[PDB]
């Protein structure tokens with residue numbers, strides 16, 4: 217049974233990285249128990265990490281004024297919102313928490329330049345990663361902060377990933393590669409994307425997180 221839930225999780229997990237966000241959204245809409253499975257599995261993984269990226273991100277944000285408006289892109293169970301006093305917009309494909317605004321984070325119900333900080337904490341799952349980051353750019357005020365955490369094994373070439381993100385109107389401010397389980401990148405918004413919506417951007421193609 218325990219071995220089965222993990223097999224199930226590992227299959228679903230691999231599936232979630234393999235398709236566009238529309239696929240993941242449909243799956244969770246039609247099969248909400250799959251969402252429960254995913255998070256049972258995800259929690260079993262992050263429990264064994266000395267420090268979760270949400271907590272590291274919360275620590276960062278607690279050092280800045282709590283008036284900064286945060287968007288948590290792929291918020292899961294909203295530990296970020298629970299950990300900071302900021303206004304935190306919580307977006308995910310399905311809801312484990314009453315603060316969740318259910319949507320594809322490629323298209324969130326916020327105005328342009330409405331947020332100070334966009335967070336992607338282990339959430340850049342679908343193949344259409346460009347969509348997520350462009351939506352982050354849209355909602356971010358000029359000079360706003362983008363924080364990205366992903367498992368390090370997802371990055372076969374950090375250099376090109378960072379280069380591609382820069383093409384979407386961001387500047388790297390710092391990167392923390394010191395945690396053994398994830399890389400954390402802080403970018404600041406310089407403006408709108410500087411490659412048109414028909415440019416290629418291969419640097420964004422990440423490897424799936426396979427949890428060991």
Ligand SMILES: Nc1ncnc2c1ncn2[C@@H]1O[C@H](CSCC[C@H](N)C(=O)O)[C@@H](O)[C@H]1O
Pocket residue numbers: 237240258269270289290291292293295307308309310319320321322336337338339340341342
């Ligand atoms: N396109 C999308 N739109 C909204 N949420 C998405 C999404 N793609 C992935 N997610 C969400 O991203 C989450 C990844 S697990 C990480 C959850 C949370 N940030 C934490 O650190 O605890 C899942 O809840 C998943 O449903």
